Amino acid sequence: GGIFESLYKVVMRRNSVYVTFVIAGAFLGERAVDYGIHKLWEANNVGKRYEDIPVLGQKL
Amino acid sequence: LIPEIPATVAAVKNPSSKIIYDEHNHERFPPGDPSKRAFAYFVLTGGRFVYASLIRLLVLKFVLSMSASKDVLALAS
Amino acid sequence: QPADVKAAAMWGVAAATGGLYLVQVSILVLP
Amino acid sequence: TIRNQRFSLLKEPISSTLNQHLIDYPTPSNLSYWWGFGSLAGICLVIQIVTGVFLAMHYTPHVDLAFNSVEHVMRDVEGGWLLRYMHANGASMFFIVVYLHIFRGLYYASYSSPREFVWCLGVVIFLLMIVTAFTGYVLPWGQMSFWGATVITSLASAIPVVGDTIVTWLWGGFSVDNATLNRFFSLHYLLPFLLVGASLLHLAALHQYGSNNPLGVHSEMDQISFYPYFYVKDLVGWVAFAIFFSIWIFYAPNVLGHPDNYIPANPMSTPPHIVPEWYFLPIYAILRSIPDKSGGVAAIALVFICLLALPFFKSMYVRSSSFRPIYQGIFWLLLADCLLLGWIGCQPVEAPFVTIGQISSFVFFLFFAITPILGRVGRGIPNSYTTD
Amino acid sequence: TIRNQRFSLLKEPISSTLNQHLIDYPTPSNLSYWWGFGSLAGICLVIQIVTGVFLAMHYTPHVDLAFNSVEHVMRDVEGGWLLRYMHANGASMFFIVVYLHIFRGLYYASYSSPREFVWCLGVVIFLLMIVTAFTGYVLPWGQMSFWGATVITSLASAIPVVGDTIVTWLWGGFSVDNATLNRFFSLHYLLPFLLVGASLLHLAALHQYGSNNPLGVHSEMDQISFYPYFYVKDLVGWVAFAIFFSIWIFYAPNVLGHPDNYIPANPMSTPPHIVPEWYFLPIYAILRSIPDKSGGVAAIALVFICLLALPFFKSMYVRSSSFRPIYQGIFWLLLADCLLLGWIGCQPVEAPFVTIGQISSFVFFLFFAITPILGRVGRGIPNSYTTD
Amino acid sequence: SFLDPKKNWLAAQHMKSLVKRLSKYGLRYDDLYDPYYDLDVKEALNRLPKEVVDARHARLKRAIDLSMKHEYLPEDLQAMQTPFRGYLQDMLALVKRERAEREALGGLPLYQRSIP
Amino acid sequence: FLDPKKNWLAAQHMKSLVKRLSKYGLRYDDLYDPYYDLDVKEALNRLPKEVVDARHARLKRAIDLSMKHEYLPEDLQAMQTPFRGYLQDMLALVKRERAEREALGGLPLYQRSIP
Amino acid sequence: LFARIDAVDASTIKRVANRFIYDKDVAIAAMGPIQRLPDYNWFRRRTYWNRY
Ligand SMILES: CCCCCCCCCCCCCCCCCC(=O)OC[C@H](COP(=O)(O)OCCN)OC(=O)CCCCCCCCCCCCCCCCC
Ligand code: HEM
Ligand code: HEM
Numbered sequence A: 001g002g003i004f005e006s007l008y009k010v011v012m013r014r015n016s017v018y019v020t021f022v023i024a025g026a027f028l029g030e031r032a033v034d035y036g037i038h039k040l041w042e043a044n045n046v047g048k049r050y051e052d053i054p055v056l057g058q059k060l
Numbered sequence B: 001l002i003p004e005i006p007a008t009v010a011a012v013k014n015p016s017s018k019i020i021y022d023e024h025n026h027e028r029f030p031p032g033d034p035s036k037r038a039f040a041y042f043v044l045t046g047g048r049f050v051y052a053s054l055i056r057l058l059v060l061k062f063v064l065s066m067s068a069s070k071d072v073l074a075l076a077s
Numbered sequence C: 001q002p003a004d005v006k007a008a009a010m011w012g013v014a015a016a017t018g019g020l021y022l023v024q025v026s027i028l029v030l031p
Numbered sequence D, E: 001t002i003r004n005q006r007f008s009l010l011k012e013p014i015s016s017t018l019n020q021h022l023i024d025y026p027t028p029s030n031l032s033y034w035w036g037f038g039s040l041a042g043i044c045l046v047i048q049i050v051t052g053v054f055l056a057m058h059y060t061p062h063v064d065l066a067f068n069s070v071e072h073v074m075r076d077v078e079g080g081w082l083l084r085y086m087h088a089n090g091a092s093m094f095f096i097v098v099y100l101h102i103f104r105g106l107y108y109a110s111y112s113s114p115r116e117f118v119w120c121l122g123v124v125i126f127l128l129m130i131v132t133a134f135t136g137y138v139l140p141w142g143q144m145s146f147w148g149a150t151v152i153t154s155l156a157s158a159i160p161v162v163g164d165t166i167v168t169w170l171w172g173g174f175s176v177d178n179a180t181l182n183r184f185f186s187l188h189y190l191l192p193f194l195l196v197g198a199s200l201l202h203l204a205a206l207h208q209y210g211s212n213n214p215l216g217v218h219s220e221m222d223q224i225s226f227y228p229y230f231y232v233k234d235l236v237g238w239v240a241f242a243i244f245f246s247i248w249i250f251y252a253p254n255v256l257g258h259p260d261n262y263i264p265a266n267p268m269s270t271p272p273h274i275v276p277e278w279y280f281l282p283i284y285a286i287l288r289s290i291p292d293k294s295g296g297v298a299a300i301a302l303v304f305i306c307l308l309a310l311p312f313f314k315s316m317y318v319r320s321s322s323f324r325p326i327y328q329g330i331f332w333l334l335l336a337d338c339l340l341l342g343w344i345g346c347q348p349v350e351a352p353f354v355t356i357g358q359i360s361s362f363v364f365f366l367f368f369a370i371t372p373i374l375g376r377v378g379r380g381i382p383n384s385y386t387t388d
Numbered sequence F: 001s002f003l004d005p006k007k008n009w010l011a012a013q014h015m016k017s018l019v020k021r022l023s024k025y026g027l028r029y030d031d032l033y034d035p036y037y038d039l040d041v042k043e044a045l046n047r048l049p050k051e052v053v054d055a056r057h058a059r060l061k062r063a064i065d066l067s068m069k070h071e072y073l074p075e076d077l078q079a080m081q082t083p084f085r086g087y088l089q090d091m092l093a094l095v096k097r098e099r100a101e102r103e104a105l106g107g108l109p110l111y112q113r114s115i116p
Numbered sequence G: 001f002l003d004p005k006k007n008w009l010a011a012q013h014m015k016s017l018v019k020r021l022s023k024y025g026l027r028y029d030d031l032y033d034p035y036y037d038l039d040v041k042e043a044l045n046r047l048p049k050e051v052v053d054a055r056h057a058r059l060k061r062a063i064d065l066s067m068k069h070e071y072l073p074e075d076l077q078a079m080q081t082p083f084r085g086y087l088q089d090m091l092a093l094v095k096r097e098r099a100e101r102e103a104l105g106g107l108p109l110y111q112r113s114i115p
Numbered sequence H: 001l002f003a004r005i006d007a008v009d010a011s012t013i014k015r016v017a018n019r020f021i022y023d024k025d026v027a028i029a030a031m032g033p034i035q036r037l038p039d040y041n042w043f044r045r046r047t048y049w050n051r052y
C-alpha cells in the first residue's frame, strides 16, 4: 500500500508525466521481454544456430 | 396499522447509516479503510504499457512493409 | 500563465519522447 | 438549457453526433459478452482493409505474375509474411466472429420485430462478405483458387433462359483466364467499401431501435451509456480476439488453409479434391446434396430466402430462448446440424456422405419451417397455465 | 401532430434523413448556377469512380505490361477507348469544375464565418484531388508519366533532416520502378473513397450552416425547398456539362494532354519538356519561379497555409463582392494572375518567364495579404458615409 | 387441439419449467410482451391502470438488474412469486378484437408501424 | 484618415455604394449578418421590434429582386436611404460591454459554437 | 482572523484544493427526476484533468 501510494505521488500528478512514464515503461518492458525470450530460445535450441556448424567456412 | 407505507417511501423518510449493498460478486471493504486507488492505476499502467507497445509494433510493421525490399537491396551494387 | 508554460513544456517533452520511442534514432544521435 | 456559451466539447456540433451515437447511446445494462462479436466484426473488417491495401501495394494481377508476386510478398518484403498471414487468417477470423454474431441473433431472436431491417441488412452484408472472400481467394492463382473459381462460376450456368451467356460474360472469354483474374482483382478491391457502407447502415438501423438483451424484454427502464461501461467490455473482447488471432498467425498460419493452393494453377490438370474454404463448406454441402444442379442453385437461393423470411413470421410474443425450452432445444439442434453439414462439405461425394448431407439439408430447412408453428401454438400459453 | 398512422413515405424513418437533407433542405431563393457547379463536381467524382473501376478491370500494374495494357483497353476491349477517354478527360473536367467552385467561393467570400469549417474541408478535398490525379497520371507509364513522377517525388528531398529518407522510402528502391508503380496503383485505387468521405463531411458542414447567396446577406426570410426548384437548375447545369464533356471526349480527346505520354517510359533519355498536367501548372509555376528548391517546397506549403488562413480574418463584415468594388477588382486581378501563372508553368525557364513568374507568384500572395486591410477599412466605412 | 397441463404430462413439464424460469427471475409471463413488438401490446398497456403498469415496469427493472448482476431472486421471494397470474391478455384480446372489427368493415388503422 | 469630403476616391466609392445599395433597396447595416459576428446578433436582439422587422422586410425584398433578376423601380430607388443606419450605436455599445467584461475577469456572455 | 484570511493566496488555494479535491471520492445524494443526472463514475472521473 505505502509503496503504491508513494510511486503514485511520484508519477501520477500530471498527465504529461504519466504519458512519459507509460512510454518509457513500454520501451523498457519490450526490451526486457526481448532479452528474456532470447535467453529462453538459446537455452532451448543449443547447437543448431548458424554460427555453430563445424564447417561454416570451408566450402572454398 | 392501515397505511403499510411503501418500501421506497419508508427508505426515503428514514435515512440510516447502516447502508447495505449487494456484495454478491464484489465484496465490500470494512467501513474504516483507505481506498486502494493507486493499485488500480498501476494495473492500468501495465496494461497501457502493453497497448502502446502493440500500437508501435503495428505502425512500424505496416510502414516498413511499404519500405524497400531485399530484392532491390541486393540488386543495388 | 507560468503554469501554462510549464504544462506546455512538459507536454512537449512527452511528445518528443513518444516520437523518439516511435522512430528509434539511437543510431542517428551522434551529439 | 440555452446554449449561450460552450460547456463541453463533446456536445459541440463537431463532436455532437459521435458524442450521441458512441459515448452517450443508452444500452441495456445486462448485455453479455455475446454483443462484443458485433463490436468485433468491424475490427476484423478494418484489419482486412488495411492489410489488403498494403498487400495490393505488392500484388500483380497478371496471370504469369500473381503467384510469384505473392511469394515476393512472402520472402523479399520486410514484414510481408506478417501482412499475408494477417490477411488470410483475418478473413477466417472475420467469418468466425460473423458466424458467432449470427448465431447469437438466432438464439435471442434478435431478428424479431422491430429489427427486421437490421436482420435484412445483415443478410445483405453476409452476401457481400461471401462474394468478397471468394473473389479474393481466386487472387493468389493457385490450383485450388483456379479450380474453385472454375467450378463455382461455371455452376452459374444453371439459369434456364440465359445461363451460358452470363457465364461467358462473367469469364470474359471461354474459360477462367487472365481477364477473369484481373476482373476479380478489381472487384475484390472495390467490394469491401460497399461492405463498410452496409455495416454503417446496419448500425444506423440498430441504433434506431436499440439493442436487445438476454431476457428479451422491454429494457428502457434500466439502461446505461455505452462509454465507458461497454467500452471496457468490448476491450476485453478485443484483447481475447487478439490473442486468438496471434495464435492463428504465428503458430498455425496454414492450418485453416488447403495445401493444394501452393501449386501454380494448371488448367490442364485437376486436383483430386476441389473444395472451397472452410467457411463456404455448409453452402457447398447443401448445393452438392441436392442433385440436379439447377435444383442445387435453387436450394442455395432458398437458403437466403429463408434467412430473409425469418423476421416476418407469426406472433411469437416471447422472443428470448431463455424462456423457450422447445425453441432452445431446436436452436441447439440447428447449430449441431450446421456444424455437421460444414463437416460434410469437405468430405467426398461418395456414400454415405450423400445421404448424411441430404438429411442435414432437410433438417436445416425444417428449422425454418417449424418456428412459425412453434409461435402459433405458443400464442395460447397463458390461457392454459393460468392459476385462476 | 402525433404520428399514429404513417402519412408519407418520405417522412418515414427509412427516408427521413434523405427527405430532410435532399428534398426539404431550405435554400436561398436567389442562387445562381455556381452552386450547380458544386453539384457538378460531385457528379464528376462519381463518373471518375465508375470509369476507373471498369478501367482497373483491364489494367496491369506491372512496369512491363502497363502501357501495352492501356493500348489493349483502347484497341481490343469492346468500347474501351470510350472508358479511357472518359477517365482522362473526366479528370480534366473534374478539375475545371472544382476551380470554378473555388473561384465562386472566393468571389462571394463564402469562406467567411460561419463557413470556416466548410472552406477548410474544401482545402483538404483539393489536396486529396491533387494527390489522386498525380498518382493516377503515373499509372499509364509513359515518358511524361515516369519523368513527372521522378521530378515531383524527388522534390520531396527539400525537407531539412529527413528529406532523403522520405524520398527513398516513397520510391521503394532508389528509383521510380515497378515497386513505385504497384504502390501508386494501390494508392490511386484507395484515395477516391477517402475523397468521397471528405465530400460527405464538406456537405454536412455546409448543411449545418445553411448556404450563402449572391447578396451575402442573411437569407432566412425567403427560402425555398431544394426539390424541385434547385434540382431542375442543377439538371440544366448537368446537361450543359454533358454536352461540353461530350465535345471533349469524341472530337478533341488528346488536346488536354501531351504527346510525350504515348512513348513507352525510357529512363535513359529525357524528354526536352517535362511539365505536369495542365491543372497542376499554376502550382508548378509558383514552385519553379521561386528558386532554391527548399524555398519552392516552403512556398507551396505557404500557398496552402494562405488558403487555410482565408476564413479566419478579423472584421470582414460585408461579404458579397456586389457591394465591394475594391475587392471585386482585386478578385478579378487575382483571377487574371492565376491564369497567367498557369500559362507560365508550361514555358521553359529561359527569360523573361522567370521574371514573369516571380512577379505573378508575388501578386498571388499579395492578394492573400491585402484582404484584411480592406476588411478593416470597410469596418471603418459606416461612420463616414452617413447622409445627414 | 387444446393441450393443458391437466390432460398432458408433456404440457405439465413445460409449464413447470416455465414457472421455474420466471420465478428465478421473478417476472410474470405477461411481462415478456414487448410494446415495441406488436403495437397492440402498446395500446393494451396504454389502456391499463397506472398501478398495474408501474408494477410491470418495476418487475422488469428488477429482472434486468438481476440479469446484469448474474444472480437470481432469493429463495424467499422466489417462493413468493406468482407467474401466470395474468393482467394483460384480456385487454390485448379486446384491442385485437376491436382492430379486427374496424379492419373488417371499412376503417383505417388507428395506429401503424413505421418503416422500419 | 481623410475619407469624407476631402478625398475624390472616397467620394467615388461612396457614390458607387449608394448606387448599388439603393438599386437593391437595401441599407448598409442590413449587410451585417447575425451569424457572422454574434455581436450583431445581440445588437439585433436589443433593437426595437419595428426596426428589426423593417430590416427583415428590406432583406426579403432584396432577395426577391435578386431572384427575379431585376432592380427596384426608379421611384423607389429615388426614395432610398442607403446610409440611414440603425445598428452602429448598439453594436458599438455591445462591443464596449464585451471589452470591459474581458478586461476584468469575466466569462463571455456567448461564444461561437465549434462547427 | 483577518490575517489568517488574507494570508491565503492563489498558491495556498491550489495546494489546499489538491489536498482536498484532486482525485478524491465524492458522495452524491440526489432525489427527484434525476434520470438524467450522471452516475458516480462520471463525477469521479471529473475530479481531475488530463490536459495538465
Ligand atoms: C508599378 C508598381 C505599382 C503597381 C500598382 C500601382 C497602382 C495601385 C492602385 C491604384 C488605383 C487604386 C484605385 C482605388 C480607388 C477606387 C475607387 C472606387 O472604388 O471607385 C468606384 C468604382 C465603382 O465602379 P462602378 O460601380 O462601375 O462605377 C460607376 C459609378 N456610378 O470602383 C471601381 O471601379 C473598382 C476598382 C477596383 C480596383 C481594384 C484594384 C486596384 C486597387 C488595389 C490595388 C492593389 C494592387 C495589389 C494587389 C493586386 C491584386 C492581387
Ligand atoms: C479494400 C480491401 C481489400 C484489399 C485491397 C484486398 C486485397 C487483397 C489482395 C491484393 C489479395 C491477394 C494477396 C494475397 O493473396 O495474400 C487478397 C487476398 C484475399 N483477400 Fe483481400 N483485400 C481486401 C479486403 C478483403 C476482405 C474484406 C476480405 C474478407 C471478406 C478479403 C479476403 C481475402 C482472401 C480470403 C484472400 C485470399 C488470401 C490467400 O489465400 O492468399 N479481402 N486481398
Ligand atoms: C460485417 C459484419 C457485421 C458487422 C460489422 C455487424 C455489426 C454489428 C454491430 C456493431 C451491432 C451492434 C452491436 C451488437 O449488437 O452486437 C450489430 C448488431 C446486430 N447484428 Fe450485426 N454485424 C455484422 C453482420 C451481421 C449479420 C450477418 C447479421 C445477420 C444476418 C447481423 C445481425 C445483427 C443483429 C440481429 C443485431 C442486433 C443485436 C441485438 O440483438 O441487440 N449482423 N451488428
Ligand code: HEM
Pocket (backbone or CB within 6 Å): E034, E035, E036, E037, E038, E039, E041, E042, E045, E098, E101, E102, E105, E110, E111, E115, E118, E119, E120, E121, E122, E123, E125, E126, E199, E202, E203, E206, E211, E212, E213
Ligand atoms: C470534390 C470536390 C467538391 C465537391 C463535390 C464539393 C461539393 C460541394 C457541395 C455539394 C456544396 C453545396 C452546394 C453548393 O453550394 O455548390 C459545396 C459548397 C461549398 N464548397 Fe464545395 N465541393 C468540392 C470542392 C470544394 C473546394 C475545393 C472548396 C474550396 C476549398 C469548396 C468550398 C465550398 C464552399 C465555400 C461552399 C459553400 C457554398 C456557398 O457558400 O453557397 N468546395 N461544395
Ligand code: HEM
Pocket (backbone or CB within 6 Å): E045, E048, E049, E050, E051, E052, E053, E055, E056, E059, E070, E084, E087, E088, E090, E091, E092, E094, E129, E132, E133, E134, E136, E137, E138, E139, E140, E188, E189, E190, E192, E193
Ligand atoms: C476508385 C476510383 C478510380 C480508379 C479505380 C481509377 C483507376 C485508374 C486506372 C486503372 C487508371 C489507368 C488507366 C488509364 O491509363 O487510362 C487511371 C488513370 C487515371 N486516373 Fe484514375 N481511377 C479512379 C479515380 C480517379 C479520380 C477520382 C481521379 C481524379 C480526377 C483520377 C485521375 C486519373 C488520371 C489523371 C489518370 C491518368 C489518365 C490517363 O490514362 O492518361 N482517377 N485511373
